[PDB]
Design a protein around this motif. Structure first.
Motif, PDB file in Angstrom:
ATOM      1  N   UNK A  19       0.825  -1.201   0.000  1.00 46.73           N
ATOM      2  CA  UNK A  19       0.000   0.000   0.000  1.00 46.73           C
ATOM      3  C   UNK A  19       0.864   1.258   0.000  1.00 46.73           C
ATOM      4  N   UNK A  20       2.002   1.187   0.698  1.00 47.59           N
ATOM      5  CA  UNK A  20       2.817   2.377   0.926  1.00 47.59           C
ATOM      6  C   UNK A  20       3.510   2.857  -0.344  1.00 47.59           C
ATOM      7  N   UNK A  21       3.853   1.940  -1.254  1.00 47.18           N
ATOM      8  CA  UNK A  21       4.564   2.333  -2.468  1.00 47.18           C
ATOM      9  C   UNK A  21       3.704   3.235  -3.345  1.00 47.18           C
ATOM     10  N   UNK A  24       3.682   6.655  -1.811  1.00 40.98           N
ATOM     11  CA  UNK A  24       4.941   7.339  -2.096  1.00 40.98           C
ATOM     12  C   UNK A  24       4.973   7.865  -3.527  1.00 40.98           C
ATOM     13  N   UNK A  25       4.477   7.073  -4.481  1.00 45.40           N
ATOM     14  CA  UNK A  25       4.415   7.532  -5.867  1.00 45.40           C
ATOM     15  C   UNK A  25       3.496   8.742  -6.010  1.00 45.40           C
ATOM     16  N   UNK A  26       2.349   8.721  -5.323  1.00 43.33           N
ATOM     17  CA  UNK A  26       1.440   9.864  -5.368  1.00 43.33           C
ATOM     18  C   UNK A  26       2.081  11.107  -4.756  1.00 43.33           C
ATOM     19  N   UNK A  27       2.812  10.937  -3.650  1.00 42.45           N
ATOM     20  CA  UNK A  27       3.511  12.065  -3.041  1.00 42.45           C
ATOM     21  C   UNK A  27       4.575  12.629  -3.977  1.00 42.45           C
ATOM     22  N   UNK A  62       2.431   4.144 -14.013  1.00 41.46           N
ATOM     23  CA  UNK A  62       3.459   3.244 -14.531  1.00 41.46           C
ATOM     24  C   UNK A  62       4.400   2.779 -13.423  1.00 41.46           C
ATOM     25  N   UNK A  63       4.761   3.681 -12.507  1.00 40.64           N
ATOM     26  CA  UNK A  63       5.641   3.302 -11.400  1.00 40.64           C
ATOM     27  C   UNK A  63       4.977   2.267 -10.490  1.00 40.64           C
TER      28      UNK A  63
END
Length: 180
Positions: A19-21, A24-27, A62-63
């Protein structure tokens, strides 16, 4: 044959035992948007930069998909190691690779779909924000909106990860049935 049956029972017992990745991508996407807004403030602001802002959403999707693909590859490697552990059934081990690949493709398609919906929602929120203000206040509004979007992306990651775990468990059960 008796030894193979005992090995299959042991494998079934092991399967029973064991969930955290995106956030982090959104941040990171929000930080990139803030940097673009600061650059626009240094110069004078264009519509082309606003249009480009929405491409960062696709980049973030994509990330996240890349992280999911890495997880799928790790799961496949673990399955290969399990197959290698003790020589119980080779044809059954060979068979389930196609099923695992199909499951990974389905997970990637689900990521594409749900993440694309999330990216479209983020783009709509950005368009609404543009529909203007004091630069620091605009940055704070973008922080709030993209924080909501990041929470939505984390919820999508959690639910889709639970679904992927269920699919992997079903694939393991099918492999056990094939071995039997």
């Amino acid at each position: 044959q008796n030894t193979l049956l005992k090995e299959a029972q042991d494998e079934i017992s092991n399967s029973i035992a064991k969930i955290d990745n995106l956030v982090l991508l959104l941040a990171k996407k929000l930080k990139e948007r803030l940097i673009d807004e600061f650059k626009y403030l240094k110069n004078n602001a264009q519509k082309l930069n606003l249009s480009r802002i929405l491409n960062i959403v696709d980049i973030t999707t994509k990330d996240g998909i890349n992280d999911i693909l890495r997880e799928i590859k790790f799961e496949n490697i673990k399955k290969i190691e399990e197959l290698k552990t003790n020589l119980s059934l080779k044809y059954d081990f060979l068979k389930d690779d196609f099923d695992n690949g199909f499951e990974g493709f389905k997970d990637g398609i689900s990521k594409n779909i749900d993440s694309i919906f999330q990216s479209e929602k983020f783009a709509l929120l950005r368009l609404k924000i543009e529909k203007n203000l004091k630069s620091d206040l605009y940055e704070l509004e973008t922080n709030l909106d993209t924080v909501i979007f990041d929470t939505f992306k984390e919820f999508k990651m959690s639910e889709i990860l639970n679904s992927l775990n269920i699919n992997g468990a079903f694939f393991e059960f099918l492999n056990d049935k094939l071995k039997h």
